[PDB]
Design a binder for this molecule. Structure first.
Ligand code: S7G
Length: 185
């Protein structure tokens, strides 16, 4: 792809994080802790899942960023509405304000309702995310496989400001402790 020139510097918003998450001092990395991280509860924190939002809000333009997923077994990535539900159980779908892909149990799927199978020959170590607000497009790229397209959500109805969206996943296996990292420009 040729989206690299729309690169934006994303930082994570501590106040939105599930209380188990550890965000690095530079606000560029997040991982699962082995316990509650000794923060107060608030209405913004994701309660049920190890999720966090980026601080940046997008309402126009073209935006691109990259995330490192090396050696993780499970994760969700993409964008969401600023007003997505934070508490209780919910599915990742455009109807609920999320435009995401994920890895789970050795298969990759797009967060449509119902979910769509992805066809990935080279397991990605880094994912590129491209948003065109005006066009209503969210696209995902395999940086490990020379930038090959993973999935395009088109005809998106954002219906609000967008935030970068992250889920580090559960670590019940002991094989998913690795962080999500925002990669340098
Ligand atoms: C080993 C592991 O993944 N433990 C879960 C427990 N439960 C839980 C609930 C919300 C957010 C994160 C978590 C972590």
């Amino acid at each position: 792809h040729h989206h690299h020139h729309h690169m934006v510097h994303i930082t994570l918003d501590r106040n939105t994080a599930n209380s188990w998450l550890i965000i690095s001092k530079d606000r560029r990395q997040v991982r699962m802790g082995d316990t509650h991280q000794n923060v107060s509860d608030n209405k913004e924190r994701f309660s049920n899942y190890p999720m966090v939002l980026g601080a940046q809000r997008f309402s126009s333009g073209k935006m691109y960023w990259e995330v490192d997923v090396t050696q993780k077994e499970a994760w969700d990535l993409g964008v969401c509405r600023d007003s997505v539900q934070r508490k209780g159980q919910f599915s990742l779908s455009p109807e609920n304000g999320f435009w995401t892909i994920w890895l789970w149990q050795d298969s990759y799927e797009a967060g449509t309702s119902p979910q769509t199978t992805l066809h990935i020959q080279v397991p990605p170590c880094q994912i590129g995310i491209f948003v065109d607000y005006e066009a209503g497009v969210v696209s995902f790229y395999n940086i490990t496989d020379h930038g090959s397209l993973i999935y395009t959500f088109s005809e998106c109805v954002f219906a609000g400001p967008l935030r970068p969206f992250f889920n580090v996943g559960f670590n019940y296996s002991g094989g998913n402790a690795a962080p999500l990292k925002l990669c340098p420009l």
